[PDB]
Amino acid sequence: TVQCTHGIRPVVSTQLLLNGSLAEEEIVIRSENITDNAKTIIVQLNEAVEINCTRPNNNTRKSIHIGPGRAFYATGDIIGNIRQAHCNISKARWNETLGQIVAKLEEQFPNKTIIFNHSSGGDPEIVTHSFNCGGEFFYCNTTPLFNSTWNNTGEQNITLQCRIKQIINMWQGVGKAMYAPPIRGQIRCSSNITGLLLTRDGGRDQNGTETFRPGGGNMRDNWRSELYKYKVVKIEPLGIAPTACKRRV
Amino acid sequence: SVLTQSASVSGSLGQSVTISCTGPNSVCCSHKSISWYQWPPGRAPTLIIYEDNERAPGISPRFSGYKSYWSAYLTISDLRPEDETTYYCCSYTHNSGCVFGTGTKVSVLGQSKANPSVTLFPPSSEELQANKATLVCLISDFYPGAVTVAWKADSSPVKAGVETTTPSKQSNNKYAASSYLSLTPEQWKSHRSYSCQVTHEGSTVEKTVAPTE
Amino acid sequence: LGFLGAAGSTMGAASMALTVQARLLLSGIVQQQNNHMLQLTVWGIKQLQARVLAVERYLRDQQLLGIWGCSGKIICCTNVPWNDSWSNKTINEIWDNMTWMQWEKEIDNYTQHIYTLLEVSQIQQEKNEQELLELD
Amino acid sequence: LGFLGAAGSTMGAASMALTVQARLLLSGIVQQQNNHMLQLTVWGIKQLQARVLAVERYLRDQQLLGIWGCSGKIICCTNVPWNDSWSNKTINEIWDNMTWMQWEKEIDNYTQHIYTLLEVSQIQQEKNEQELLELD
Amino acid sequence: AKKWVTVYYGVPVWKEATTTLFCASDAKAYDTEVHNVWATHACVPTDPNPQEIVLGNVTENFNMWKNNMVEQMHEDIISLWDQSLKPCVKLTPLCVTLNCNNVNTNNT
Amino acid sequence: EGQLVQSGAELKKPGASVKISCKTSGYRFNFYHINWIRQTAGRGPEWMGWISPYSGDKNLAPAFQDRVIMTTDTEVPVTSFTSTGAAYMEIRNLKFDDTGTYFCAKGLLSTWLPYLWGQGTLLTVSSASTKGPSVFPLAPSSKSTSGGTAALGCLVKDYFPEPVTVSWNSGALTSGVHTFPAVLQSSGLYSLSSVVTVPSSSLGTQTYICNVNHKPSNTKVDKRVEPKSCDKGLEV
Ligand SMILES: *[C@@H]1O[C@H](CO)[C@@H](O[C@@H]2O[C@H](CO)[C@@H](O[C@@H]3O[C@H](CO[C@H]4O[C@H](CO[C@H]5O[C@H](CO)[C@@H](O)[C@H](O)[C@@H]5O)[C@@H](O)[C@H](O)[C@@H]4O)[C@@H](O)[C@H](O[C@H]4O[C@H](CO)[C@@H](O)[C@H](O)[C@@H]4O)[C@@H]3O)[C@H](O)[C@H]2NC(C)=O)[C@H](O)[C@H]1NC(C)=O
Ligand SMILES: *[C@@H]1O[C@H](CO)[C@@H](O[C@@H]2O[C@H](CO)[C@@H](O[C@@H]3O[C@H](CO)[C@@H](O)[C@H](O[C@H]4O[C@H](CO)[C@@H](O)[C@H](O)[C@@H]4O)[C@@H]3O)[C@H](O)[C@H]2NC(C)=O)[C@H](O)[C@H]1NC(C)=O
Ligand SMILES: *[C@@H]1O[C@H](CO)[C@@H](O[C@@H]2O[C@H](CO)[C@@H](O[C@@H]3O[C@H](CO)[C@@H](O)[C@H](O)[C@@H]3O)[C@H](O)[C@H]2NC(C)=O)[C@H](O)[C@H]1NC(C)=O
Ligand SMILES: *[C@@H]1O[C@H](CO)[C@@H](O[C@@H]2O[C@H](CO)[C@@H](O[C@@H]3O[C@H](CO)[C@@H](O)[C@H](O)[C@@H]3O)[C@H](O)[C@H]2NC(C)=O)[C@H](O)[C@H]1NC(C)=O
Ligand SMILES: *[C@@H]1O[C@H](CO)[C@@H](O[C@@H]2O[C@H](CO)[C@@H](O[C@@H]3O[C@H](CO)[C@@H](O)[C@H](O)[C@@H]3O)[C@H](O)[C@H]2NC(C)=O)[C@H](O)[C@H]1NC(C)=O
Ligand SMILES: *[C@@H]1O[C@H](CO)[C@@H](O[C@@H]2O[C@H](CO)[C@@H](O[C@@H]3O[C@H](CO)[C@@H](O)[C@H](O)[C@@H]3O)[C@H](O)[C@H]2NC(C)=O)[C@H](O)[C@H]1NC(C)=O
Ligand SMILES: *[C@@H]1O[C@H](CO)[C@@H](O[C@@H]2O[C@H](CO)[C@@H](O[C@@H]3O[C@H](CO)[C@@H](O)[C@H](O)[C@@H]3O)[C@H](O)[C@H]2NC(C)=O)[C@H](O)[C@H]1NC(C)=O
Ligand SMILES: *[C@@H]1O[C@H](CO)[C@@H](O[C@@H]2O[C@H](CO)[C@@H](O[C@@H]3O[C@H](CO)[C@@H](O)[C@H](O)[C@@H]3O)[C@H](O)[C@H]2NC(C)=O)[C@H](O)[C@H]1NC(C)=O
Ligand SMILES: *[C@@H]1O[C@H](CO)[C@@H](O[C@@H]2O[C@H](CO)[C@@H](O[C@@H]3O[C@H](CO)[C@@H](O)[C@H](O)[C@@H]3O)[C@H](O)[C@H]2NC(C)=O)[C@H](O)[C@H]1NC(C)=O
Ligand SMILES: *[C@@H]1O[C@H](CO)[C@@H](O[C@@H]2O[C@H](CO)[C@@H](O)[C@H](O)[C@H]2NC(C)=O)[C@H](O)[C@H]1NC(C)=O
Ligand SMILES: *[C@@H]1O[C@H](CO)[C@@H](O)[C@H](O)[C@H]1NC(C)=O
Ligand SMILES: *[C@@H]1O[C@H](CO)[C@@H](O)[C@H](O)[C@H]1NC(C)=O
Ligand SMILES: *[C@@H]1O[C@H](CO)[C@@H](O)[C@H](O)[C@H]1NC(C)=O
Ligand SMILES: *[C@@H]1O[C@H](CO)[C@@H](O)[C@H](O)[C@H]1NC(C)=O
């Protein structure tokens, strides 16, 4: 019984989870729904998988005034060679984390049935690992991950197709749209992997093919790996119980 | 067993009955809380008293308790047919394990002379095929629990073909007993007129079945 | 014994410590300091709306104790007999067995009819008898 | 007997049932569930401002009963004598004739002077005498 | 044996329900960064001593997917996202005609 | 009222280690204590020991200390109150005095005492070998043809050791069936039978098949009531 919850950080990302609860000794499978492939499945990690995120695009400050007073700040000039954002990740550490993911799905789902593929369809923000880092929004690729097909159960250079975007009306803002301002100079990460979001394999009857990929398109499920351990209750202090005693004059 | 019961108590239907349980001055009924149990041998026992005067929830207010300076007792006002069985007492504390009694046998009299559904089974084409000569007798609800088994191999004194059992308490709270015949076809073929004699005060409509037809 | 630190324990041990369950119930670890220059933000609105629901749950039961002569203390008995039809279990039995947890799920039904009867025998009859009995 | 269901009836029959007038006074048929995605609408502001005025009318009189030793019950007498100059009618007479309705319009005037005197004889004198009288 | 009604206050019994919650945050940068989008200038502060009381003999059924706290966090962030940047520069007249070429080098 | 599931028909030779189990269902197994008791052939029930499933507290008799060692597992919650658990009992260096019925009991809250018991586990501590029941069907009874009702059943000749569960058409025919008291013979072997009173005016279009089961000798022998009548009852 707590009156104050865990240090939950408001996660602003799709595909991968950045902060929060890491329940130890096994990877926890959050099941909203599992028998029917169609519904989303969140998975809590046992041990954190550190992820670097940089942007060696060095930009100056350009201010143009729109009418009276109002100041608009945009990307100035890029100093140096033309290059991608560059997130980076480990090769073996991830493989080790995936090791228990494929082993747990053999227990949850039937036998060793065919189960691999990449993010299906979608717009940039939906199918890519869209996340805020240092200010700007990074749109790195989820293709080198699902490249491994396996049945029976400083560091290395692993990166994804990194792309930047400034026009961002996140969670589909049909009223007020937001323009992300560029960040002058240095771009650092000091972030984490605290989980992931998966999807279905259509509506195949029986079979031996049930290829799973990342198709989780919800922001609510992102905090379901944080508020999984919470449930609010109303306290009833008034209680009526009979016993051998009474009042007099 | 140190904690002793009245061993044999007799009562009548619709009448009050009391069982005197007494123990030594070591496991005396003065400081220790006493409990009673309705335990039919073979069946599941039922908790009657859970704390001296207090009865277990669901148990009739007919049952009551009393505790003296060393001995404890149980009073059953208005007796019912389900009551005739062996009872057990218990001495205990909130520090130690249970102490069990010797056991008292209760016979609830007043019941009508229940006529039994007596049946004599002759050996079939399968019983005789396996070279086994047997003749059994069933008895169901025959209150009182008294039994008289008598076999008649051509109405001669039977010595070897005698097999009696213990009359157990039946579902209707009456009695049920068993009678068997263990003989080879050689001693079986020397006698043919097999008469069944069960002595219970009453009529003479006994089922006399021949093993050979 | 801790906030709700007796809920697990049986009714007898729950009635033993029930003051802490009312102590940390209002201004405990939720009150705090309650500290662009404006306080009309999303956190300001959420804290004051929750404050209204906070007193509402206390005052509902606080008014009842006030109209039962039980306002002066945590545990106070009444001059109301228990209709056996409501509950058939022994007084001492639920106190070391059933626990307040399941017990609330048993009374909740006749709880409003119980509150209706608690008002008259202890206050609408007892305190109304005083009008004539006070001076004699 | 119903919310204000004794206002019509004489003081004697009004004092007979006055608990319901305080029961449905707070959380009765006005409390409710209290259930674009925002609650800052015209109905949200109106309900919370009314909630402040709701407790204000209760607490004003609730504080008075608390400082009179009458907090524990609905009806409790005091050690304050009645100055004949305020009202000259017989005790039994207003109870079956005048009714609480007209009676409030009679006292309302000296009501503040009555409240001033009610504080001292019953609490500032009676409860202050206890300091020395409690241990003897 | 003469059963009489006894009133008890402060009974440790709960009923499954959802209410309006609020913030709990510790002092971050304090001097340099004073207001970040979520915490803002005035956030409800947190206590260094939380109620860690564990209830033995309690096997309450938790609802992971049907939790109503999740929906509260969903509405709070978006409403704050719309609020944030409201007093800032509107880029409504900025959107105009756009004519261009590519870089000084052909994609290298 | 809670129902207990007592695992039965387990027994072995003297000196050997006996393992008796019991599954708890439809109640809070955690705060409810567990009591174990046995009864000898001399009608003297010996209280074995008391065990707690929430805390490591135990109270055991001196005659059952080095020989008897008990164990318990964690509760499996079904609802906010109901749970499922199990208790195991290990006895070493057994004698013929240890032969009798062993029972498992559910606790009360003066709490140490029980409240509800199981079915029963008849333990036979004997050095003699196991014998399989000789199932034989019985010919029609010596009753009547008036209406149809007349007795018909089966007979179990010899086996060793009890208990033996016998039903009709695998848990279908339970009413109007009497279980005969199974008692030991001169050779030291148990014997039983079963009698069913069904409306049989003439043998035809009816179920006569039964079910016989055992644990140390696993039995399958099921024989139906004899059509070739050897009695006058099902004639006139
Ligand atoms: C789970 O939640 C945590 C929340 O704590 C997420 O934390 C991430 O942490 C990193 C690493 O710190 C953030 O990036 C930087 O944080 C710096 C902290 O700076 C403080 O001290 C400064 C002293 O300045 C000198 O050192 C800093 C070292 O970075 C140099 O950058 C600087 O040039 C100087 O040499 C103070 O001046 C400063 O204000 C702080 O008190 C920040 O310095 C740095 O911010 C730069 O830009 C800021 C924009 O306002 C500006 O105010 C600063 O002055 C500075 O120039 C930068 O933010 C990550 O941003 C942060 N977030 C994320 C999402 O990664 C954690 O990541 C999160 N996620 C998980 C686990 O997945
Ligand atoms: C996760 O969600 C699933 C939702 O599918 C839920 O399990 C479902 O339960 C229903 C119970 O009615 C199952 O329904 C039947 O399953 C049988 C066996 O395969 C089918 O033969 C049935 O066919 C029906 O529907 C057809 C399509 O319209 C019709 O043509 C036909 O006439 C029948 O009406 C029917 O599908 C359903 O299969 C499951 N889902 C499964 C097994 O995948 C599950 O409980 C949730 N799990 C949790 C708690 O995580
Ligand atoms: C992640 O990648 C690594 C390789 O980079 C895979 O590691 C290797 O996994 C295999 C089989 O799962 C291990 O094989 C075993 O080696 C032991 C060594 O004694 C041997 O006794 C066994 O018979 C078996 O051959 C291997 O040691 C391990 N190490 C290597 C080669 O790097 C890992 O399996 C990948 N992740 C997966 C598929 O889960
Ligand atoms: C997972 O990755 C694999 C990578 O190769 C994709 O495989 C194949 O993709 C092709 C082109 O879309 C599919 O072609 C189609 O074949 C059907 C067969 O009848 C035909 O009718 C269509 O017109 C088209 O030619 C091919 O089936 C597909 N193979 C499969 C089933 O794996 C695969 O599609 C990826 N899965 C997804 C979509 O996530
Ligand atoms: C991402 O997850 C990792 C888990 O490995 C977090 O690592 C831990 O970060 C904390 C600081 O937030 C470290 O604390 C300090 O460690 C130093 C070195 O010994 C010590 O001297 C200080 O007293 C302090 O305890 C902690 O060691 C570190 N754990 C390790 C060894 O990895 C990381 O913080 C997460 N990133 C976040 C919060 O964004
Ligand atoms: C209030 O007390 C009464 C009277 O004792 C309860 O009513 C009925 O009480 C009898 C007690 O003999 C219950 O019979 C029970 O039958 C079960 C199943 O056959 C058996 O295992 C018990 O030993 C007992 O013989 C009967 O079910 C019960 N009737 C009902 C449906 O209420 C009464 O239930 C008590 N309290 C309540 C919940 O109202
Ligand atoms: C009032 O006393 C009753 C007496 O048992 C308590 O339970 C009653 O239980 C029945 C059967 O469970 C309820 O029926 C309900 O049907 C709905 C249909 O959607 C189903 O969702 C429920 O699970 C349940 O089966 C019945 O409503 C319920 N109440 C009454 C008044 O009969 C009940 O807890 C006591 N307390 C309260 C708060 O009324
Ligand atoms: C308090 O009691 C006093 C004294 O009894 C009331 O003062 C005066 O009382 C006399 C009673 O004889 C009133 O005289 C009345 O005159 C009318 C009209 O002529 C007549 O119909 C009555 O039979 C009676 O004789 C007198 O009016 C009254 N004076 C005033 C103006 O107050 C006193 O009014 C009582 N209470 C109050 C309201 O202060
Ligand atoms: C206080 O005691 C008086 C004694 O009668 C109660 O009534 C008083 O009545 C006179 C005459 O009706 C009031 O004069 C007023 O003049 C205004 C001028 O606008 C007119 O609008 C009124 O209709 C009335 O004629 C006088 O104010 C009033 N009060 C006092 C203090 O003399 C009065 O009800 C008692 N209670 C209260 C609340 O003061
Ligand atoms: C981007 O690279 C340029 C190239 O060095 C950095 O430019 C220096 O900026 C400092 C700031 O005062 C000047 O004093 C130096 O003279 C600059 N050097 C030259 C020759 O340009 C710049 O700092 C880098 N990025 C940012 C945004 O800090
Ligand atoms: C990831 O990289 C692959 C290989 O170049 C490319 O085909 C794909 O379009 C990229 N993005 C996604 C969303 O997979
Ligand atoms: C990426 O981050 C890890 C964790 O600090 C670090 O050890 C590694 O050196 C970083 N990458 C580089 C630049 O080598
Ligand atoms: C204790 O409460 C449980 C709740 O179901 C009940 O089943 C049990 O019989 C109760 N024991 C007694 C009689 O106190
Ligand atoms: C009752 O009250 C009315 C109010 O005006 C009054 O006129 C009447 O004289 C009163 N009767 C008595 C004396 O109670």
Numbering used by the authors:
A (entry chain G): 244 to 309, 312 to 321, 321A, 322 to 358, 360 to 398, 410 to 505
B (entry chain E): 2 to 214
C (entry chain B), D (entry chain B): 520 to 554, 564 to 664
E (entry chain G): 32 to 139
F (entry chain D): 1 to 52, 52A, 53 to 72, 72A, 72B, 72C, 72D, 72E, ...
Please give me the paper's original passages concerning this structure.
BG18 exhibits the highest potency among the V3/N332gp120 bNAbs described to date. To better understand the molecular mechanism underlying BG18’s interactions with Env glycans and increased potency compared with other V3/N332gp120 bNAbs, we determined the crystal structures of natively glycosylated clade A (BG505) and clade B (B41) Envs in complex with BG18 Fab. We found that BG18 binds the V3/N332gp120 glycan site in a distinct manner relative to PGT121-like bNAbs, primarily through rearrangements in its VH and VL domains. Analysis of BG18 interactions bound to a natively glycosylated Env showed engagement with oligomannose glycans near the base of the V3-loop and the conserved GDIR peptide motif.
We solved the structures of BG18-BG505-35O22, BG18-B41-35O22, and BG18-BG505-IOMA complexes to resolutions of 4.1, 4.9, and 6.7 Å, respectively by molecular replacement using synchrotron radiation datasets. The BG18-BG505-35O22, BG18-B41-35O22, and BG18-BG505-IOMA structures each comprised an Env trimer bound to three BG18 Fabs and three 35O22 or IOMA Fabs, with ordered electron density corresponding to native glycans at the Fab interfaces. Modeling of oligomannose N-linked glycans into ordered electron density was also possible in the 4.9 Å BG18-B41-35O22 structure, and for the N332gp120 glycan in the 6.7 Å BG18-BG505-IOMA structure. Overlay of BG505 and B41 Env structures showed conservation of the glycan shield surrounding the BG18 binding site. B41 Env harbors a GNIR sequence instead of GDIR, allowing us to analyze the D325Ngp120 substitution in our BG18-B41-35O22 structure. Side chain placement was not possible due to low resolution (4.9 Å), but the BG18 interaction with B41 resembled its interaction with BG505 in the BG18-BG505-35O22 structure, suggesting that BG18 recognizes the GNIR motif analogously to how it recognizes GDIR. However, while BG18 S53LC potentially engages N325gp120, the loss of BG18 Q54LC contacts resulted in the disorder of CDRL2 residues 54-60 in our BG18-B41 structure. The demonstration that two HIV-1 Env trimers (BG505 and B41) can be crystallized in different crystal packing lattices without converting their glycans to exclusively high-mannose forms provides an impetus for further crystallization efforts using natively glycosylated HIV-1 Envs.
